[PDB]
Structure 1
Amino acid sequence: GNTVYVGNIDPRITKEQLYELFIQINPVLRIKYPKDKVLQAYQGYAFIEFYNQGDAQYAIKIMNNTVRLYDRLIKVRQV
């Protein structure tokens, strides 16, 4: 319940950029940002862990379809 799924992420985006963005919305505990280790390429999605379920739910409501990174509209969903 404390983790959200973030999608439509341009592979140029860094974990530190995702952190700067999402700490605007609530405190962030950790980010899991899957990478193909053979190609060292991000895969278009991430998991952002907030400190509790309320804070995650708030983030989904505020951020889904709200921000474009490299012109791509970011999706935020419960997972």
Structure 2
Amino acid sequence: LPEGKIMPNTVFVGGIDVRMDETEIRSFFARYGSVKEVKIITDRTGVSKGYGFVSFYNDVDVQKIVESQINFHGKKLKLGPAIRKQH
């Protein structure tokens, strides 16, 4: 039974490859607004889970952003609305 809340003004970014970095994602997403955070999710040992979230200070149309074809280092980012489920 579907869970979580849709986070406003935030985009899920999956398919983040080890050859990529936060800075190029940050710089790209500035085309849509003032980026608040590029937050890559890691495990407890600091190992990337290969996805993260880009949030904005301004209102963005997430539906439109997730249509974008954004490639880095030979790989296409996998975009979606950001959903937050329940140290």
| TM bracket, shorter-chain basis | 0.7 to 0.9
TM (norm. structure 1) is 0.73
Q: Percent identity?
A: 26
Change (3 A) 1:34 1:56: farther
Q: Please say if 1:68 is aligned against 2:74.
A: no
Give, as a single letter, the amino acid of the residue that structure 1 aligns with 2:39: K
| Bigger strand fraction | 2
Show the counterpart of 1:48. 54
- 1:16, 1:10 → 2: CA distance? 13
Show CA shifts across 1:11-63 (max 9, x none): 2322212111211232211111112352x4322111001124x41424223x2
- Shift of residue 9, structure 1, vs aligned partner: 1.1
| Bigger helix fraction | 1
TM (norm. structure 2) is 0.68
Q: Secondary structure at the match of 1:24?
A: helix
Larger Rg: 2
Q: Where in structure 2 are the equivalents of 1:14-53 lying within 5 Å?
A: 14-36=21-43, 38=45, 40-52=46-58
CA RMSD between the two structures = 1.9
Show the counterpart of 1:12. 19
Q: Structure 1 segments of 4 or more deviating over 6 A?
A: none
**Size of the alignment, in residue pairs?**
74
- 1:15, 1:41 → 2: CA distance? 14
